[PDB]
């Protein structure tokens, strides 16, 4: 969940701070870079302001990233988190040398969990695969989640087909698939509308089918 959704984002921007929010209750801030023996969480300080209150703590936690680096992160309460309104955070080092002073709009970094319960079956109806899945667990009003299905033909084959699932739909038929080939289906998810923009979730764990002869 965390490590993964951290990974998904670390996929661009070097020494950048990346806050995001999951089920739209708690924002989560983080940044990276392993160095040497003399650091730690208590080495940095994380100050925020839900626009116009006394300042607080996107309050620190160090962890080592599987890639052999270091990650610093932290969260913020729900009721306090009232979306659309900005938030500015100030992040300083040992001594109050500042390394981030950023404004972030909670509503615009919504990051979902991957969908799940993926199920592919042949079509008792032709040369199609029929795909069913379930929305990312514990996600508020599912009815405005749009998905995108991917279709690989596999490392050895090394191919593709992509499909934009209507917002709130969890089914789709996959036509135009070669006979006798092996297809790997995976689905991902983003908040459709309105307002709140964000990022694609990870691809759901995949499911493969071997297609019958032509």
């Amino acid at each position, epitope marked *: 969940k965390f490590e993964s959704k951290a990974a998904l984002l670390a996929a661009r*921007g070097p020494e*950048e701070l990346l806050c995001f929010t999951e089920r739209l209750e708690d924002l989560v801030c983080f940044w990276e870079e392993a160095a040497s023996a003399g650091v730690g969480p208590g080495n940095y300080s994380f*100050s925020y*302001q839900l626009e*116009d*209150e*006394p*300042w607080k703590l996107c309050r620190l936690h160090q962890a080592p990233t599987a890639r052999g680096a270091v990650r610093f992160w932290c969260s913020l309460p729900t009721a306090d988190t009232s979306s659309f309104v*900005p938030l*500015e955070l*100030r992040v*300083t080092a040992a001594s*109050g*040398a*500042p390394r981030y*002073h*950023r*404004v972030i*709009h909670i509503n615009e970094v919504v990051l979902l969990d991957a969908p799940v319960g993926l199920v592919a079956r042949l079509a008792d109806e032709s040369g199609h695969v029929v795909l069913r899945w379930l929305p990312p667990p514990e996600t508020p009003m599912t009815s405005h989640i749009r998905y995108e299905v991917d279709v690989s033909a596999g490392n050895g084959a090394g191919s593709v087909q992509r499909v934009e699932i209507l917002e709130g739909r969890t089914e789709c038929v996959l036509s135009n698939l070669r006979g006798r080939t092996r297809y790997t289906f995976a689905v991902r998810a983003r908040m459709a509308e309105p307002s709140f923009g964000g990022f694609w979730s990870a691809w759901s764990e995949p499911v493969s089918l071997l297609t019958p002869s032509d």
Partner: antibody, heavy 116, light 108 residues
Framework: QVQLQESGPGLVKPSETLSLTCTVSGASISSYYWSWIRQPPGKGLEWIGYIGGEGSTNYNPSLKSRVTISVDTSKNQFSLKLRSVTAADTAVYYC??????????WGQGTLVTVSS | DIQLTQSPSSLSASVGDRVTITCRASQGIRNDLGWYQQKPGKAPKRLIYAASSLQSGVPSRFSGSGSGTEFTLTISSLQPEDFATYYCLQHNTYPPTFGQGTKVEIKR
């Protein structure tokens, strides 16, 4: 309301100091962060440093060798202290409230010239 | 210190038409910028914050966009009072730094 005014303007003679203070009125200085800013007349602005009800500070590496920012809560004002004055200090000086990178609001503006 | 090189250096537009100002940074700061207005006798006022969010109080004829490395402030309809010198500021990598400072003049 958001208001700020700088005290005791005037003139300064080289390698001396400055006693600019900023009267804050409206919201409580307990919360936000405050900055001063410098500008040689027709040349450009330079940010100098911040300070909160935090006590904490930061100064531009171009003046950290000199600069000191002060904070009195009951007085509800904040002072700039600047020593080793020269002819590279002939500039306009503003106080502002860093809600982000400026402060929504700047202080009226004070001129202070430097010569013999 | 990071360098914010604005352009054009100054300008000359009629009442009405659509002025636009750019601001390039020696290193992408992405989101972390403010546009500012300096009137002659007046302490400077903050039009845009967080690259594109309009400050309260400033006219909606002022807007800003851009990300990372280049930035634009654009005055959708010029006013006579829109006379002033505008500056971009950066607070991505301390210290905060301003731009040269595009002055704009009213063709009349």
């Amino acid at each position: 309301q958001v208001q700020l005014q700088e005290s005791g303007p005037g003139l300064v003679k080289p390698s001396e100091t400055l006693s600019l203070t900023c009267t804050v009125s409206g919201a409580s200085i307990s919360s936000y962060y405050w900055s001063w800013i410098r500008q040689p007349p027709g040349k450009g602005l330079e940010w100098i440093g911040y300070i909160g009800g935090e006590g904490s500070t930061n100064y531009n590496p171009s003046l950290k060798s000199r600069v000191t920012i002060s904070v009195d809560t009951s007085k509800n004002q904040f002072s700039l202290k600047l020593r080793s004055v020269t002819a590279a200090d002939t500039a306009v000086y503003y106080c502002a409230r860093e809600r982000l990178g400026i402060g929504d609001y700047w202080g009226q503006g004070t001129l202070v010239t430097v010569s013999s | 210190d990071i360098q914010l090189t604005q352009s054009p250096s100054s300008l000359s537009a009629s009442v009405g038409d659509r002025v636009t100002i750019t601001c390039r940074a020696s290193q992408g700061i992405r989101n972390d910028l403010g546009w500012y207005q300096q009137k002659p006798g007046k302490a400077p006022k903050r039009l845009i914050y967080a690259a594109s969010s309009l400050q309260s109080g400033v006219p909606s004829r002022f807007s800003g966009s851009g990300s990372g490395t280049e930035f634009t402030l654009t005055i959708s309809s010029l006013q006579p009072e829109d006379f002033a010198t505008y500056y971009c500021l950066q607070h991505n990598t301390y210290p905060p730094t301003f731009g040269q400072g595009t002055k704009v003049e009213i063709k009349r």
